[PDB]
Amino acid sequence: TRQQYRKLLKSTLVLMPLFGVHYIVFMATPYTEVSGTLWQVQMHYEMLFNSFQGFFVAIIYCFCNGEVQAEIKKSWSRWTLAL
Amino acid sequence: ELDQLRQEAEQLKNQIRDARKACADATLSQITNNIDPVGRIQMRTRRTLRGHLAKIYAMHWGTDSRLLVSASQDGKLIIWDSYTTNKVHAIPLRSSWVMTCAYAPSGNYVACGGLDNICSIYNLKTREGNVRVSRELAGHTGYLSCCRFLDDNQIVTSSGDTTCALWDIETGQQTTTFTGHTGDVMSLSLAPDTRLFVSGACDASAKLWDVREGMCRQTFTGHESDINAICFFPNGNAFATGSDDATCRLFDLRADQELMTYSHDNIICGITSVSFSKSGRLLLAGYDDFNCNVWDALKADRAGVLAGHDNRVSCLGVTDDGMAVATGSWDSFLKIWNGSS
């Protein structure tokens, strides 16, 4: 069904930053000369995704986590009611 | 033969209703208008007790308001110290499914029961320090729902077969049997002087039983759904009952009718446990919506709300001196709440 494919693709995307799948693209590349297209694209590719991997992981698994959101909502509501 | 008896019963029921209406001089809320409101009450969690594996189903305070007994569905019966949080005993129960637990006024014995229909009593007087099953009682066909201690030798027990029993510990046999319910008896409360006890069942009615005579005295029918909790007034001339209809009702023995109902439009969940305070002014009823509400017994106003539980508040207890209130939920946590100035 279309829904099953949608959930599988969504599940794959969320798990990708956690498992470091983006590392596999340029894993086996040996030392290439600096003045080269492959070297330039690799450095830009890795220095972008590697840097932002932590940001994506934090968003997905802590900020977007259902339990964290529910816990924050309860604490804020109780604090506001007490205040 | 059946018609002539049913019609007589209907005529009698009408007579009781007429008698109730005749004595309805006024309404409790009407005469409490000239009373200063209790006001907002803020209670903070002072002690958090953890260590139970499964959900907490019932608990009971001690006479000295120091040691409390808690029962969990995992098969553990832990005795906690409310002050230092230390655990004194951890009884591995034979049957994992446990629905109630009792603490003897003397503190020498502790009772429990559950789906096994067996009321197990353990003695803490052993010199060796090793707990053991002092006595086992097997006379109930339905599930064991509640049990209260009269003394070191007499215990009042409630079961799910519409029967309440008065066991003798030394002999291990039922002394008196109460058979006047048409639904499962959920819980019962003991009067301060241990002469009469009330029982609430699934038939939306509460019955008053005499321990000695063994015969029902008064029947109250004012609820719309199953009655889950019931508790005596501190003075003993009234009792409060909680039901699944999201309403608490106060019944007066002398008036033989309900006095005032505590209900809120926003609340639509059931009620699991209810208990009075030392003075009886407050009504702390544990609701099904993951929190407990403290009502004013005279103004029917929500004095305060205790929301510190992750699941339904299965049980609730108040100390004899009323210093603190312990609430147990299905999150395997026991919270002790005390007021602050």
Binding site: - | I16, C23, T219, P234, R254, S340
Partner: protein
């Protein structure tokens, strides 16, 4: 049969319940009012206790 026995038991229970002494609501309520007023000063919940005598610090 069981049905007739149950009906007779219910009738007997109702007969016993009816023949009891009942006190008027106002008189029965006054006792509760007096009890609450007399013991108001001895209720820690109604009257918060100073932290020095409070055992839950």
């Amino acid at each position: 049969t069981a049905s007739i026995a149950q009906a007779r038991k219910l009738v007997e229970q109702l007969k016993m319940e009816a023949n009891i002494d009942r006190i008027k609501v106002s008189k029965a309520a006054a006792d509760l009012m007096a009890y609450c007023e007399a013991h108001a000063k001895e209720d820690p919940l109604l009257t918060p206790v100073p932290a020095s005598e409070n055992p839950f610090r």
